[PDB]
Amino acid sequence: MQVWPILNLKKYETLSYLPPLTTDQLARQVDYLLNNKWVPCLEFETDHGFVYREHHNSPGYYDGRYWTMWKLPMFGCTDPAQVLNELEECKKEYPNAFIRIIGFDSNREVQCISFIAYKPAGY
Amino acid sequence: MQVWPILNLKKYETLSYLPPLTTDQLARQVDYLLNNKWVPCLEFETDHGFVYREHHNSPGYYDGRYWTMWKLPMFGCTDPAQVLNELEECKKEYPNAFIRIIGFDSNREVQCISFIAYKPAGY
Amino acid sequence: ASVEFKAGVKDYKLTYYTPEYETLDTDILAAFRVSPQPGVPPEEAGAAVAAESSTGTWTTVWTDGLTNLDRYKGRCYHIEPVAGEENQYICYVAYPLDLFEEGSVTNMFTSIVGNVFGFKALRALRLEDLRIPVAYVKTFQGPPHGIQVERDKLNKYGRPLLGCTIKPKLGLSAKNYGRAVYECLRGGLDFTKDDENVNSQPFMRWRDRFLFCAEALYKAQAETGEIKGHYLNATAGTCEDMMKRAVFARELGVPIVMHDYLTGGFTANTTLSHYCRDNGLLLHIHRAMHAVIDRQKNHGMHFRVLAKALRLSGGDHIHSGTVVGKLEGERDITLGFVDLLRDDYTEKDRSRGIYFTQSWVSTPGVLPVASGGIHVWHMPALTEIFGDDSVLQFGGGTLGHPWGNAPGAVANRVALEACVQARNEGRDLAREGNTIIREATKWSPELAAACEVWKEIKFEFPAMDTV
Amino acid sequence: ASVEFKAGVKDYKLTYYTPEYETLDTDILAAFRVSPQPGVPPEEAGAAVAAESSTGTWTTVWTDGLTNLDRYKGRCYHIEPVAGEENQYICYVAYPLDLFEEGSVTNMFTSIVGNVFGFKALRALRLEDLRIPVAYVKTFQGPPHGIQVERDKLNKYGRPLLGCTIKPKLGLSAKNYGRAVYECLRGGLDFTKDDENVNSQPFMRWRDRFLFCAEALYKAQAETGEIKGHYLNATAGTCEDMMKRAVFARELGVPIVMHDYLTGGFTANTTLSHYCRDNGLLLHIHRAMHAVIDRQKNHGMHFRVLAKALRLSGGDHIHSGTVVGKLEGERDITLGFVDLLRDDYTEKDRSRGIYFTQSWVSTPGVLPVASGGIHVWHMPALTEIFGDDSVLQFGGGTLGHPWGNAPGAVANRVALEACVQARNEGRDLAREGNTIIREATKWSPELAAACEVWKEIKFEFPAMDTV
Amino acid sequence: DKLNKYGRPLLGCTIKPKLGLSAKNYGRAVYECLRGGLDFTKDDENVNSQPFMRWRDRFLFCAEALYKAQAETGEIKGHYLNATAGTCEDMMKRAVFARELGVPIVMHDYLTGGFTANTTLSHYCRDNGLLLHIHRAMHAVIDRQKNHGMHFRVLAKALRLSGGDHIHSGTVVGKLEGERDITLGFVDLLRDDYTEKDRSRGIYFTQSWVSTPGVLPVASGGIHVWHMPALTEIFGDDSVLQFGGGTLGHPWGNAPGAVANRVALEACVQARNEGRDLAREGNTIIREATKWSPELAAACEVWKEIKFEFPAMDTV
Amino acid sequence: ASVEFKAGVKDYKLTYYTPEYETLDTDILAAFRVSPQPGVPPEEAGAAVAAESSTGTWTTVWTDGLTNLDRYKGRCYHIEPVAGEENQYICYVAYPLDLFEEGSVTNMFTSIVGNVFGFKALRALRLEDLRIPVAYVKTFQGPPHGIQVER
Ligand SMILES: O=C(O)[C@@](O)(COP(=O)(O)O)[C@H](O)[C@H](O)COP(=O)(O)O
Ligand SMILES: O=C(O)[C@@](O)(COP(=O)(O)O)[C@H](O)[C@H](O)COP(=O)(O)O
Ligand SMILES: O=C(O)[C@@](O)(COP(=O)(O)O)[C@H](O)[C@H](O)COP(=O)(O)O
Ligand SMILES: [Ca+2]
Ligand SMILES: [Ca+2]
Ligand SMILES: [Ca+2]
């Protein structure tokens, strides 16, 4: 039997327990986002990469949930290259940042997609 | 579209989104203080440059507001050179301090001026 | 319009069988499966049920002249024979809006299901479905949070949530509960839970349990960086006990509590839904006892009725069956009521056992929870049946992994994320599931050990409640 | 005593079928009617039910080694075939005392009836009876007052009590409710009542109702000189609503309130029993919804189980059926559970559907309430079946008398006192009932009119739940 | 003194779509606006608690957001959390929860909630140290017409009595009506201790306030960066300037909208304090600041021609 | 269904004048008497009222893309001229049920009569009537007793 590790095993919600996504693997989630007519958005975070409680500890309140918005939601977008381009731009501007791709459904007003698309060095 | 930066973008209230004040620019704010007959005071802070909540988190309570007063409020002052002189003295005594100039209206008992006049190295 | 008072008994169908009636958009509509005794017209059986579930009794009372009995009466307005049954009929009843107490699931069940199932003149009776009009919908809080809010609170998107009941159902001490909890959450499950009948007992007192499971869960969050919860059961003997568990949960700062709505009861449930809305606690509903009422085709209340009343009373989560596991749940029926649980509009659909079109006027949807003898091999089928807005709950599928809780959790979390990825890529979960799972074991030795243990385990029997 | 951990699924009968087991006097004992699927040994079906109602799940979990699974486990310790049924067995289960939360009917039902009735491998399942050990009995308050105290409070001895539901079940205004109430109490009924589904509605708001029915009942007491009550329904959507009705009843100074224990729910019931004990209000229990669970032989929970749990939770009164009226109730079964409701000791008796000897360690007895399509002609049979410690309740039998409420009440009160006198004199109520009633009409023209109206009315059908 | 903000008008911003945004999206929009240099953001008047967004959820996420803004920028922020509600008990539950999260400022719609319930809230915020921002929704039902109703100076004086730290006061130059002279009028009534009779500005009586604290006027409604000069000259330092559409309508999104706004305002304050004439040199001062602020430049291109000029109804 | 974000101002009637709309039995319907300035089409005056009492402001905001603005927007769905008045119109507005707080008169009036009566582009405005759908009616207690009980 194996012991599941303890140190440096920070995880990043959906997809983070699979092998790192390949370039195509990455493409395919982006297509999946766009095939469901959801709106792409990028978000990034330099300082607080994981949730914490600084300002309150009542039920349902966590810090570190909000990241910062890269540019605006890509409304209209039908081209995955557009999204992967913006990922490259965000990366070049913020190479010490975690960067995630999210996908909005506006009918339900819920994020239907959210995954990590880039982690900084040592991550 | 540009993404407003995230790291090292601490701001210092009034005037702190402008380009740094020139020596003349600085003089002009001081004249403005003195032409409204307001009382110059300088204040400095080495340790806690920005607000934080150590001792309480009730509504309206922040730490880090109070800085420490350089000498007294310059009552009577009609000369701007006097004030810029004290700025220079404070700076020589406290080169690792943020220093601000403030202006008191005694009729309303409110500060009507307040701006940063010196930041330490890396700021 | 007055007529003299004539004491004595008449047929119910004289007043309460009204075939030509056009239902109003404010009426509550019931669908009964009715099995009359020999000798009893379906009309009169239909009529009986409507009368004694709304205004009438077994003989004429004079006090009806004081009111307008036409505007208050329940009405049997349509009968239809049941296919492949001797002497069995669907009877529809409309109940006017005024009959009901605003915001009380208790009062709606007290009329509609109060006394009629014991009538001598029926062999059997079963409430199949109910049409709650929108103006009655608006009198209830509903779910404290609902799917959108819950996902935004926990920061969890793109997949089903994963849960795990602590096992031995009973007999573990507090500190051991806490130990099991940390181990399970740190391997990738989002939630763990009190077993339904774990309340407070001689082997484990509640306040001790809550305490340690807080430490545990706060340690798993800290190690993994993803938000965790553990369903702390508020179920209790009295309302005052229940409220004491909630308030202590609140005071610990954790995200979620549970309640056993039917064995606690709708009056106390509603109370607890209210307090979690005021206090921002998520509310996981357990449906223990439901099968006492809802198993048989011929007699009882369908689970879609209990779920609708849960959505009114309030739950963020409800168990919904698994289809594939150790408890009964037919796929088509299950798709049915799940749709009733999460969506805003659901059209009539007899193939899925929806007898009424149902609107919810933006009452938040409820997250279905699949739990009960499932394991990694069922992952594909579960993801396909329920989709992303579900909680998948793996008790013996976690704690029975050969390598302990952490690795059991990893196996289940990996199998799930392999099915999501495969799905999102365009693969067919129903066709390719065993394969997908197979592929994932090549790189996850946690999953591989799970897969080896339970390879042959299936649960397939003749179901009882079918369409 | 330790053994290595071997993950994977085994038979339940390996751990949970224990035929040689001698029950302990602290154990809770369940009697299940079990109908296995084809292919499923009665042993393994028995075992399944015991395991998943106490400690076990569908695969081996390692965490059992942390505890002493032998002392906590539910146990199937006896199977016996069912007479005149293919593939149906009584299975007995013993549950240790530690499994249960002291004073919570909710927790005892959550284990014993929580999940097992939905098992795929069963066709059907039914809890017939439960043996609550005395040390568990002592953890409950029971009835707020109980028969002795109730009779001493109201000053009413030597006869059944007489009641009357107000009719039209719904749609009467407050002031009209109050009018009907005064008229009914002033002709000789001891009590009148809120109909179960009369809570607070658009046609009649609760606080208005309580108010006027106080005036009414205070006027009937004043005119007749005997103590009256009117069952003011506290049933409500939430505990806080419920408690508000109780507290206002308390504030009016009246003797008695009611509660719909199953549609309100055991958590809220228990709360209300507590408050009436602290506040000296009598507590009349309505059993609305019971027939949803308890009608069928093959699947559900027998009413004797619901009654026992009511006696623990707390009720001064519970409905118990009438035998002779419009709702189903077999005489022998009914004698059975009535005995379970009022007495301190009740020996095993399969002929009356008592599977267990049952002791109550002076927990007060509960008064049975017969209500539901009865009338003056049933008086003799009712008095014979139930005896003095009962409440006889005549809704359409009061308000459907041709001469109005007062005279309907007199008819029923006279018929009852004629049956008492005749009984006390040494006459046979079963043999001489029609006669006795006949004699009494010669001097009571109220009774005579009742008798003429309902002379032919009988309710006789094939029953469903039999022994 | 509580917020540590001196020497300029404060800046705020109403979250848009007025209705129909969820709680987590409200928090998202808030964080972005405050981090770009706005002092405050706010519940739209008619955002209370609804099917698309329940209040307790909103407060919680806007706390999270605002605490992240503050921490990134180091300047104190606030978000007016609307206590307006159906009953007093509901209202007081919202104030109590704002108190508990430790934020600085709540709001109330004084006329549709009503003076009784306002005075109750004003009391609580005193006893609990919450700032209290007053919205004046419905006022124009009573105060638009010269011939019939009640002038808005009357409602403002009553709000001063009842209690508000902030009230909306009109803008003059935006999408809602307010004549300059009458506006300088009642703004004086709201802030100063003594205000002499002056029929030219619609003050019919001399009014003293015996040191009742003055109320910060809030200019909001159809304004943008080109109105910055005028606003600064009309209201001076003791004002809150509020830019909903003017923040969330910026092409580059909230943070940049906020920056354009706060840049324009500090440029008018710097210009002013140097001795320039805001009424004469406004377009120029704004023009100059776009040369070094690309955020401002984008705002200024979008709304260059937008003006709001009609015959007013309430005049002297 | 998504379209790119185009900042800047547009006519209100482009989003909130909706003449072919069939009112829902849950909507809240408002009857306004509306007197536009010179130069202002009734259609745009009606639309302004509907927008600025429900979801919209004076310039396009990107955050609309995050919701479904069609299901929340107030909608001017009928204009009729007023007899014996120059430039005065009845404008009908429908408000979806989701916009309102249950049981709060204060919330209904804050949307519906909050801001619109001060709009520079109107000379005058008057709310004549409101159609309160029954599902909203049920959220209120109403009269404490009412006529029957009182007597
Ligand atoms: O005790 C149990 O049996 C369970 O925890 C399953 O444990 P395993 O995860 O070990 O199966 C669940 O409560 C049942 O699934 C309830 O069924 P339902 O969801 O249909 O109400
Ligand atoms: O509504 C009714 O039907 C009753 O008032 C009878 O009215 P009548 O007196 O007019 O028959 C009783 O509640 C039922 O008897 C309940 O049955 P049970 O006692 O078996 O629970
Ligand atoms: O709903 C609106 O229309 C506003 O948020 C302005 O939003 P924009 O920032 O997007 O214009 C303000 O509440 C009005 O200004 C109220 O007017 P007043 O202050 O005159 O009472
Ligand atoms: Ca369980
Ligand atoms: Ca009844
Ligand atoms: Ca607004």
Instruction: Please list, residue by residue across C108-123, b when 16 or more beta carbons sit within 10 angstroms of its beta carbon and e when fewer do.
Output: bbbbbbbbbbbbbbbb
Please name which of C411, C415, C407, C375 lies closest in space to residue C393, comparing C-alpha atoms.
C375
Are C188 and A17 a contacting pair at CB < 8 A? Answer: yes
- Chain length of chain F: 151
The answer to whether the annotation marks C363 as part of a ligand binding site is no
Pocket probe mutation, ligand 3, options E11, E13, E14, E225, max atoms within 8 Å of Cβ: E14
Residue identified by tokens 């943070």 is E255
Residues C105 and C261: their CA atoms lie apart, in Å, by 12
Q: CA-CA distances (angstroms) from residue E199 to C355, D394, E156, E208?
A: 72, 81, 17, 17
D141-454 CATH fold: TIM Barrel (3.20.20)
Q: What is the resolution of this structure in A?
A: 2.3
Q: Give Cβ neighbours of residue C83 (< 8 Å, ≥ 6 apart).
A: none
Give all strands (DSSP E) within B4-109, no chain letters: 39-45, 68-70, 98-105
Active site residues of D: 167, 286
The catalytically annotated residue of C153, C167, C219, C299 is C167
- Chain length of chain B: 123
Please name which of C263, C58, C106 lies closest in space to residue D286, comparing C-alpha atoms.
C106
Torsion sign (Cα): D376, D378, D381, D384: negative
Please name which of E41, E8, E42 lies closest in space to residue E267, comparing C-alpha atoms.
E8
Give all strands (DSSP E) within D21-71, no chain letters: 28-36
E7, E99, E256 member nearest B2 (Cβ): E256
Active site residues of E: 16, 135
Residues C181 and C168: their CA atoms lie apart, in Å, by 13
Contact C61, D399 (CB under 8 A): yes
Partnered with residue D346 across adjacent β-strands are: D358
Is residue D16 helix, strand or coil? helix
Our CA dihedral for E45, E51, E53, E54, rounded to 10 degrees, sits at 90
* B1 and A CB contact within 8 Å: yes
Paired tokens of E82: 């609307």
The answer to whether the annotation marks F139 as part of a ligand binding site is no
Range of the domain at B71: 1-123
| Chains E and B contact (Cβ–Cβ under 8 Å for 3 or more pairs) | yes
Of the listed ligands, the closest to the CA of C164 is 1
Cα–ligand 2 centroid distance for D99 (angstroms): 37
Q: CA-CA distances (angstroms) from residue C154 to A58, A63, B72, E28, F108?
A: 13, 11, 52, 15, 32
* F1 and A CB contact within 8 Å: yes
Residue identified by tokens 């994981």 is A50
Cα–ligand 2 centroid distance for F35 (angstroms): 64
Q: CA-CA distances (angstroms) from residue C243 to C127, E158, E258?
A: 32, 44, 45
> Considering just the CA atoms, what is the radius of gyration of chain F in Å?
17
**Listed residues: CB within 5 A of ion ligand 6:** E 14, 44-45
Question: A with F: how many residue pairs have Cβ under 8 Å apart?
Answer: 31
Q: In 10 A of CB B64, how many CB atoms? A: 17
Contact D466, D297 (CB under 8 A): yes
The answer to whether the annotation marks F115 as part of a ligand binding site is yes
Residues E161 and E181: their CA atoms lie apart, in Å, by 23
Is residue C340 helix, strand or coil? helix
Residues C79 and C56: their CA atoms lie apart, in Å, by 20
Residues B9 and B13: their CA atoms lie apart, in Å, by 12
Contact C112, C129 (CB under 8 A): no
Can you give the residue ranges of every domain in chain C? 14-140, 141-454
- CB-CB neighbors (< 8 A) of B17 in chain E: 37, 259, 262-263, 266
Is residue D194 helix, strand or coil? coil
Residue identified by tokens 């519940």 is E43
Q: Which CATH architecture has domain F14-140?
A: 2-Layer Sandwich (3.30)
- CB-CB neighbors (< 8 A) of F145 in chain D: 208
CATH number of domain containing A10: 3.30.190.10
Residues E102 and E59: their CA atoms lie apart, in Å, by 11
Burial of E158: CB neighbours in 10 Å, binned 0-12, 13-18, 19+: middle
Q: What are phi and psi of C395, to 5 degrees?
A: -80, -85
DSSP class per residue in A7-56: SS----STTTTSS---HHHHHHHHHHHHHTTPEEEEEEESS--S-B-SS-
Are A72 and B1 a contacting pair at CB < 8 A? Answer: yes
Cα angle at C140 between C137 and C142, to 5 degrees?
Answer: 95
| Chains D and B contact (Cβ–Cβ under 8 Å for 3 or more pairs) | no
Contact E15, E82 (CB under 8 A): no
The C-alpha of A102 sits at a distance from chain B's nearest C-alpha, in angstroms, of 18
Residues C74 and C100: their CA atoms lie apart, in Å, by 12
For helices C405-425 and C429-441, the axis angle rounded to 10 degrees is 130
Q: What are phi and psi of D156, to 5 degrees?
A: -125, 110
Q: E181-188: list long-range contacts, CB under 8 Å, 24+ apart.
A: E181/E316, E182/E153, E182/E314, E182/E315, E182/E316, E183/E234, E184/E234, E185/E153, E186/E152, E186/E153, E186/E156, E187/E217, E187/E235
Of the listed ligands, the closest to the CA of E218 is 3
A54, A55, A71 member nearest E253 (Cβ): A71
Please name which of E173, E218, E171 lies closest in space to residue E308, comparing C-alpha atoms.
E173
- CB-CB neighbors (< 8 A) of C201 in chain D: 98-101, 107
Contact A116, A98 (CB under 8 A): yes
CA nearest to E29 within chain A? A69
Contact D51, D12 (CB under 8 A): yes
Pocket probe mutation, ligand 2, options D170, D172, D259, D371, max atoms within 8 Å of Cβ: D371
Residues C4 and D30: their CA atoms lie apart, in Å, by 55
- CB-CB neighbors (< 8 A) of F134 in chain C: 26, 135
Contact C79, C16 (CB under 8 A): no
Residues D184 and D178: their CA atoms lie apart, in Å, by 10
- CB-CB neighbors (< 8 A) of D290 in chain C: 118
* C167 and A CB contact within 8 Å: no
**Strand ranges across the sheet with D161-163:** D161-163, D391-393, D367-371, D317-319, D282-286, D256-260, D229-233, D191-193
Residues D460 and D328: their CA atoms lie apart, in Å, by 9
Q: In 10 A of CB B24, how many CB atoms? A: 8
Residue nearest to atom 9 of ligand 3 (CA): E244
Please name which of C335, C330, C260 lies closest in space to residue C290, comparing C-alpha atoms.
C260
| Chains D and F contact (Cβ–Cβ under 8 Å for 3 or more pairs) | yes
Paired tokens of C249: 């949960």
Torsion sign (Cα): D428, D429, D430, D431: positive
Q: Where are the alpha helices (DSSP H) in C225-260?
A: 239-252
The C-alpha of A35 sits at a distance from chain E's nearest C-alpha, in angstroms, of 23
Relative to the CA of D193, which ligand 2 atom is closest? 5
The answer to whether the annotation marks E135 as part of a ligand binding site is yes
Q: H or E segment at E80?
A: strand E78-82
Residues B73 and D14: their CA atoms lie apart, in Å, by 89
Strands E105-109 and E131-135: parallel
Relative to the CA of D286, which ligand 2 atom is closest? 21
Cβ-based interface (< 8 Å): residues of F facing D: 145, 148-149
User: Which residues, judged by CB distance below 6 Å to any ligand atom, belong to the binding site of ligand 3?
Assistant: E 14, 16, 18, 44-45, 136, 168, 170, 176, 220-222, 242-246; F 52, 57-58, 115, 118
Q: Give Cβ neighbours of residue C432 (< 8 Å, ≥ 6 apart).
A: C380, C422
Cα–ligand 4 centroid distance for D95 (angstroms): 17
Paired tokens of D313: 């939770």
Cα–ligand 4 centroid distance for C164 (angstroms): 9
- CB-CB neighbors (< 8 A) of C362 in chain F: 97-98
Mutation site for C-interface testing, chosen from F104, F108, F138 by largest number of C Cβ within 10 Å: F138
Number of domains chain B is built from: 1
Burial of D2: CB neighbours in 10 Å, binned 0-12, 13-18, 19+: exposed
The finding on whether C327 has its CB within 6 A of some atom of ligand 1 is: yes
* E308 and A CB contact within 8 Å: no
The answer to whether the annotation marks C165 as part of a ligand binding site is yes
Residues C396 and C195: their CA atoms lie apart, in Å, by 12
Burial of C48: CB neighbours in 10 Å, binned 0-12, 13-18, 19+: buried
Amino acid at D226: E
Residues D32 and D12: their CA atoms lie apart, in Å, by 17
Cα E3 to the chain's mean position, in Å?
Answer: 16
Are F139 and C136 a contacting pair at CB < 8 A? Answer: no
Paired tokens of E102: 């430790």
- CB-CB neighbors (< 8 A) of C250 in chain A: 58-59
Residues D92 and D356: their CA atoms lie apart, in Å, by 10
Is residue D145 helix, strand or coil? coil
Burial of E208: CB neighbours in 10 Å, binned 0-12, 13-18, 19+: exposed
Residue identified by tokens 């020589």 is B92
Q: H or E segment at C434?
A: helix C429-441
Q: What are phi and psi of E263, to 5 degrees?
A: -50, -55
Paired tokens of C214: 């807080």
The catalytically annotated residue of C286, C290, C317, C401 is C286
Q: CA-CA distances (angstroms) from residue D63 to C13, C165, C201, C394, D169?
A: 61, 12, 18, 15, 55
In CATH, which of 3.20.20.110, 3.40.50.150, 3.40.50.300, 3.40.50.450 is domain E1-303?
3.20.20.110
Are B6 and A68 a contacting pair at CB < 8 A? Answer: yes
Please name which of C78, C72, C33 lies closest in space to residue C53, comparing C-alpha atoms.
C72
Of the listed ligands, the closest to the CA of C198 is 4
Residue identified by tokens 């702390």 is C232
Amino acid at B38: W
Mutation site for C-interface testing, chosen from D44, D110, D165, D323 by largest number of C Cβ within 10 Å: D110
- Chain length of chain D: 467
Read off the DSSP letter of residue C396: H
Paired tokens of D400: 């459907």
The C-alpha of B6 sits at a distance from chain A's nearest C-alpha, in angstroms, of 8
Q: Where are the alpha helices (DSSP H) in chain F?
A: 13-16, 42-52, 69-72, 105-113, 134-137, 147-150
